[PDB]
Design an enzyme around this catalytic site. Structure first.
Site, PDB file in Angstrom:
ATOM      1  CG  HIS A 282      -0.595   0.357   2.468  1.00 53.33           C
ATOM      2  ND1 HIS A 282      -0.418  -0.551   3.496  1.00 53.33           N
ATOM      3  CD2 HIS A 282      -0.348   1.560   3.028  1.00 53.33           C
ATOM      4  CE1 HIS A 282      -0.090   0.098   4.604  1.00 53.33           C
ATOM      5  NE2 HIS A 282      -0.048   1.402   4.316  1.00 53.33           N
TER       6      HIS A 282
ATOM      7  CG  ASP B  84      -0.177  -3.978   2.579  1.00 53.40           C
ATOM      8  OD1 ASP B  84       0.389  -3.496   1.575  1.00 53.40           O
ATOM      9  OD2 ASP B  84      -0.580  -3.278   3.568  1.00 53.40           O
TER      10      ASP B  84
ATOM     11  N   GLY C 180       2.154   5.944   8.876  1.00 56.40           N
ATOM     12  CA  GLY C 180       3.566   6.146   8.683  1.00 56.40           C
ATOM     13  C   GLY C 180       4.427   4.961   9.113  1.00 56.40           C
TER      14      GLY C 180
ATOM     15  CB  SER D 219       2.527   0.984   6.276  1.00 54.08           C
ATOM     16  OG  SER D 219       1.218   1.084   6.877  1.00 54.08           O
ATOM     17  N   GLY D 220       4.882  -1.156   6.591  1.00 61.81           N
ATOM     18  CA  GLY D 220       6.062  -1.737   6.015  1.00 61.81           C
ATOM     19  C   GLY D 220       7.185  -1.962   6.969  1.00 61.81           C
TER      20      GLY D 220
HETATM   21  C1  LIG Z   1       0.263   2.589   5.182  1.00 64.97           C
HETATM   22  C2  LIG Z   1       0.565   2.311   6.685  1.00 64.97           C
HETATM   23  O1  LIG Z   1       1.423   3.339   7.133  1.00 64.97           O
HETATM   24  C3  LIG Z   1      -0.704   2.295   7.567  1.00 64.97           C
HETATM   25  C4  LIG Z   1      -0.357   1.814   8.967  1.00 64.97           C
HETATM   26  C5  LIG Z   1      -1.517   1.876   9.962  1.00 64.97           C
HETATM   27  C6  LIG Z   1      -1.555   0.914  10.985  1.00 64.97           C
HETATM   28  C7  LIG Z   1      -2.539   0.976  11.934  1.00 64.97           C
HETATM   29  C8  LIG Z   1      -3.518   1.941  11.889  1.00 64.97           C
HETATM   30  C9  LIG Z   1      -3.510   2.881  10.883  1.00 64.97           C
HETATM   31  C10 LIG Z   1      -2.496   2.851   9.904  1.00 64.97           C
HETATM   32  N1  LIG Z   1      -1.740   1.460   6.985  1.00 64.97           N
HETATM   33  C11 LIG Z   1      -2.870   1.964   6.464  1.00 64.97           C
HETATM   34  O2  LIG Z   1      -3.053   3.186   6.378  1.00 64.97           O
HETATM   35  C12 LIG Z   1      -3.859   0.969   5.928  1.00 64.97           C
HETATM   36  C13 LIG Z   1      -3.830   0.862   4.404  1.00 64.97           C
HETATM   37  C14 LIG Z   1      -4.757   1.972   3.956  1.00 64.97           C
HETATM   38  C15 LIG Z   1      -5.852   1.942   4.989  1.00 64.97           C
HETATM   39  N2  LIG Z   1      -5.235   1.448   6.187  1.00 64.97           N
HETATM   40  C16 LIG Z   1      -5.736   1.383   7.419  1.00 64.97           C
HETATM   41  O3  LIG Z   1      -5.147   0.809   8.333  1.00 64.97           O
HETATM   42  C17 LIG Z   1      -7.042   2.085   7.761  1.00 64.97           C
HETATM   43  C18 LIG Z   1      -6.688   3.242   8.692  1.00 64.97           C
HETATM   44  N3  LIG Z   1      -7.894   1.083   8.407  1.00 64.97           N
HETATM   45  C19 LIG Z   1      -9.214   1.076   8.272  1.00 64.97           C
HETATM   46  O4  LIG Z   1      -9.846   1.784   7.455  1.00 64.97           O
HETATM   47  C20 LIG Z   1      -9.953   0.061   9.131  1.00 64.97           C
HETATM   48  C21 LIG Z   1     -10.057  -1.262   8.353  1.00 64.97           C
HETATM   49  N4  LIG Z   1     -11.287   0.552   9.417  1.00 64.97           N
HETATM   50  C22 LIG Z   1     -11.551   1.388  10.403  1.00 64.97           C
HETATM   51  O5  LIG Z   1     -10.596   1.750  11.057  1.00 64.97           O
HETATM   52  C23 LIG Z   1     -12.949   1.858  10.649  1.00 64.97           C
HETATM   53  C24 LIG Z   1     -13.346   2.319  11.994  1.00 64.97           C
HETATM   54  C25 LIG Z   1     -13.039   1.852  13.380  1.00 64.97           C
HETATM   55  O6  LIG Z   1     -13.391   0.710  13.753  1.00 64.97           O
HETATM   56  O7  LIG Z   1     -12.466   2.609  14.208  1.00 64.97           O
END
Ligand SMILES: *C[C@@](*)(O)[C@H](Cc1ccccc1)NC(=O)[C@@H]1CCCN1C(=O)[C@H](C)NC(=O)[C@H](C)NC(=O)CCC(=O)O
Length: 224
Positions: free
Chosen positions: A41, A83, A174, A176-177
């Site tokens: 991602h 991912d 931030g 991720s990975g």
């Molecule tokens: C890319 C990477 O840096 C990041 C890491 C991360 C880890 C934990 C939490 C947030 C972010 N990963 C992401 O951004 C990934 C890939 C894109 C979307 N994503 C998510 O983790 C998103 C924030 N998650 C969601 O949309 C989850 C599945 N749903 C909810 O969070 C809905 C509501 C809730 O229950 O609070």
């Protein structure tokens, strides 16, 4: 990283950062002198790779451009299954006591194992706070059956859950990975969680590295 503490200095020499210019995009792990492993991602057309300092922004860190990257062919931009992505450095990383190859796993660590996850992602959510020093938290692996109770259809087979009961300790934007290391091997790459980050009893979700070592090796062989 939510509710962490600075990682021990020099203890993460395989951690890298993927930058958009000199802005944090994602974490990653150094696999060898030409390759970084990260989350799919995090795909971009080009990257700057930071190596060799726990201080993101360090004027003395090693920086390498990377033009080529290859997502797992099974990656979904909708579900984030598979991912993971390999990023090819445009020149070889200079290895040292501060820049080292990660130890990829032979085996999958079991549920209940204590692990450490690291990154420069935000330490607060939803309002962000980006740290200068690499942050760490310890989390425990959660079984698929337990994790499914929380995430249901969002979880797919090669996702690994980890967290601490009733705790905010977790990954966030931030991160991720970046690496989840357990008992000396890379077991996970940060992939996703819930938003805002750090909700107690919502596990972090990681790409389970022990399911992808053939693809990792095969792809590196294929591309050099
Ligand atoms: C890319 C990477 O840096 C990041 C890491 C991360 C880890 C934990 C939490 C947030 C972010 N990963 C992401 O951004 C990934 C890939 C894109 C979307 N994503 C998510 O983790 C998103 C924030 N998650 C969601 O949309 C989850 C599945 N749903 C909810 O969070 C809905 C509501 C809730 O229950 O609070």
């Amino acid at each position: 990283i939510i509710d962490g503490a600075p990682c021990a200095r020099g203890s993460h020499p395989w951690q890298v950062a993927l930058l958009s210019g000199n802005q944090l995009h994602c974490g990653g792990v150094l696999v060898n002198e030409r390759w970084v492993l990260t989350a799919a991602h995090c795909k971009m057309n080009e990257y700057t790779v930071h190596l060799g300092s726990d201080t993101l922004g360090d004027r003395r860190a090693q920086r390498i451009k990377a033009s080529k990257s290859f997502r797992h062919p099974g990656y979904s931009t909708q579900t984030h299954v598979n991912d993971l992505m390999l990023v090819k450095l445009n020149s070889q990383a200079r290895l040292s006591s501060m820049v080292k190859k990660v130890r990829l796993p032979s085996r999958c660590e079991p549920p209940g194992t204590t692990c450490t996850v690291s990154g420069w992602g935000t330490t607060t959510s939803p309002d962000v706070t980006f740290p200068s020093d690499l942050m760490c938290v310890d989390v425990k692996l959660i079984s698929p059956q337990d994790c499914t109770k929380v995430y249901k259809d969002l979880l797919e087979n090669s996702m690994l859950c980890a967290g601490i009961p009733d705790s905010k300790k977790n990954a966030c934007n931030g991160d991720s990975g970046g690496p989840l290391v357990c008992r000396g091997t890379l077991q996970g790459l940060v992939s996703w969680g819930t938003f805002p980050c750090g909700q107690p009893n919502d596990p972090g979700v990681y790409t389970q590295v022990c399911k992808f070592t053939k693809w990792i090796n095969d792809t590196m062989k294929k591309h050099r």
